[PDB]
């Protein structure tokens, strides 16, 4: 495992953040020795996305046993951003705070409210819990460009954004400005829909060594302007493949390719706009 600055925090991060993430299929035991395989493979970032009672319940007793200052732990808060108010603080402090057996939150991660502002009620909250010395900072996922204003907040040390293979110097270049400006950034959806079925994407399956969510993961992990790339794990196996990718170099044959793919892809993507003006064609003239 390989750690960055978690951006101007001074707190510490593997490359890799796991996501807990509500699945029926799994007792107290199993998320417990999930987050246990994760912390034996050096993953430090944890983030909470569920609140199933058997979850939070095997997920702090793993985050329990280990020193709370070696983990990195996020709360990813969803719903419409602008209706949070008491109620949502009520949630917080029965779920993230009794549920899992913390007494402070590395981060809280909200939904963009494309807005300026957050509610009232809600940014109050956070400062109340802030001078608590129990939420290190807030933290806006968003897919767009988040609200200047909003960035402005001090409550505000951190975004996450989708970055992968398929993503635009458009996308990439707001993940590098946040980064420049001191926020964390936190990658997400590293292997993508479109792949999950001149250049061509062949070479994601015939890569002698390598597998698709192996080389997907490979290249978000080569963005410095990401503080953790967000993985996800239904089981032990899986998390174990993840944390070596971290230390392996991606052949810099499928480098070339990721690149020559990305620029066929978006082509044809602008070859669907169709604009038929069966116009431009012989015919005297205007008058100038
Ligand atoms: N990175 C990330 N961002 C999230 C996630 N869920 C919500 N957001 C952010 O919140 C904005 C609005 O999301 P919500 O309205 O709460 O729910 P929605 O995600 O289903 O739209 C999103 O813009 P948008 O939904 O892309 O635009 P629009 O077409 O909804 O206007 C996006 O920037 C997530 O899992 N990851």
């Given at each position: 495992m390989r750690y960055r600055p978690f951006g101007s925090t001074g707190v510490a991060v593997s490359a890799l953040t796991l996501r807990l993430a509500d699945n029926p299929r799994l007792r107290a035991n199993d998320w417990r020795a999930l987050v246990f395989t994760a912390l034996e493979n050096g993953v430090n970032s944890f983030q909470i996305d569920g609140d199933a009672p058997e979850l939070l319940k095997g997920a702090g007793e793993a985050f329990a046993?280990?020193?709370?200052?070696?983990l990195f732990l996020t709360w990813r808060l969803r719903g419409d951003?602008?209706?949070?108010?008491?109620h949502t603080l009520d949630a917080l402090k029965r779920s993230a705070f009794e549920g899992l057996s913390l007494?402070?939150?590395?981060l809280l991660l909200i939904n963009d409210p494309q807005s300026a502002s957050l509610p009232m009620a809600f940014e109050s909250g956070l400062q109340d819990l802030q001078k608590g010395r129990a939420l290190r900072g807030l933290g806006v996922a968003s897919r767009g460009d988040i609200d200047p204003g909003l960035l402005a907040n001090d409550l505000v040390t951190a975004v996450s954004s989708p970055y992968?293979?398929?993503?635009?110097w458009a996308e990439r270049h707001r993940i590098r400005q946040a980064s420049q400006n001191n926020f964390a950034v936190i990658g997400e959806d590293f292997w993508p829909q479109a792949l999950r079925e001149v250049g061509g994407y062949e070479f994601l399956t015939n890569?002698?060594?390598?597998s698709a969510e192996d080389i997907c993961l490979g290249y978000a992990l080569?963005?410095?302007?990401?503080a953790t790339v967000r993985v996800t794990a239904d089981n032990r196996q899986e998390i174990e493949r993840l944390a070596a990718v971290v230390e392996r170099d991606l052949p810099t044959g499928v480098c070339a390719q990721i690149e020559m793919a990305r620029f066929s892809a978006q082509e044809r993507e602008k070859a669907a706009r169709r604009p038929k003006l069966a116009a431009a064609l012989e015919h005297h003239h205007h008058h100038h």
């Open positions: 046993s280990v020193e709370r200052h070696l951003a602008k209706q949070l108010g008491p007494d402070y939150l590395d992968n293979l398929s993503s635009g890569t002698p060594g390598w080569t963005e410095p302007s990401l």
